[PDB]
Amino acid sequence: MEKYHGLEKIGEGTYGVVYKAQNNYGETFALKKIRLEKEDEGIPSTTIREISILKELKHSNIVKLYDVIHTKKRLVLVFEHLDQDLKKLLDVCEGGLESVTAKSFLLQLLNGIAYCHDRRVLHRDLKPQNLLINREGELKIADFGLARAFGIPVRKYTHEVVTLWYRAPDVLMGSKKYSTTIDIWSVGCIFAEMVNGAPLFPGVSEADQLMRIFRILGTPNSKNWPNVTELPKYDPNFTVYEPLPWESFLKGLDESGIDLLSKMLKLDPNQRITAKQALEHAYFKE
């Protein structure tokens, strides 16, 4: 294909396997084989087009897309290559990341998200595994925009489970709206995880996920979430929980850090801080 050789499996993304490869310039790339919704139904032309426009996303914290290779029921995406990801790093660490590093990862993640959100490009699947990191501690987000083009599939058991951990309450309760707020919730979860060394809400199912959330942040109500009642899977019979003190589940974060984090994990999507507002927070000036 396109003259690439030396493939080498290097992981398994949410849409297929990822390989490290080289072209005929010696230069390295990451090749993602897209395994999609209906594989036997071919790849619609609108999909090809939607993906190819993602080539305009050019920013220091977004994994660059170089080429879209479409061959007889075989879609391959050629991406910038990075040798490490945040999940792998969190896995080996005990107690999380040092504050200075957490901050730098947080800053760079926000910058990437902000650049995309300004162009109406959503992720809808942010998680540690999609945050790629190079030698120099630079962070690049992978997979922005693929959910819109490919749709979000129900992944292999072990993957769907990890995915729940970063899913906003409104989404778990049946919302299907287009929103930038979905990504900000994921950042909050990622933020908490860098400080604690473990996922903040590790549920095993949607329902379990929602309860783990409410058990820590409080159950929704008229004051904290007007119109939550409009969500399809909302239930007024939710066992009531009062919110826990931020300090109790955020290991000596820091004052400004807790505040910023509290703005990300607002249950009401409409009150959730944006990426660009987050970048203005005193946390990053300290």
From Swiss-Prot:
The modification Phosphothreonine is found at T14, T158. Its main location: cytoplasm. One of its GO terms (molecular function) is RNA polymerase II CTD heptapeptide repeat kinase activity. Keywords: ATP-binding, Cell cycle, Cell division, Cytoplasm, Kinase, Magnesium, Metal-binding, Mitosis, Nucleotide-binding, Phosphoprotein, Serine/threonine-protein kinase, Transferase. It comes from the Eukaryota. Serine/threonine-protein kinase. Involved in the control of the cell cycle. Required for entry into S-phase and mitosis. Probable component of the kinase complex that phosphorylates the repetitive C-terminus of RNA polymerase II. In schizonts, phosphorylates ORC1 resulting in its dissociation from DNA, relocalization to the cytoplasm and likely its degradation. This is Cyclin-dependent kinase 2 homolog. It comes from Plasmodium falciparum (isolate K1 / Thailand). The lineage of its organism: Eukaryota, Sar, Alveolata, Apicomplexa, Aconoidasida. The gene is CRK2.
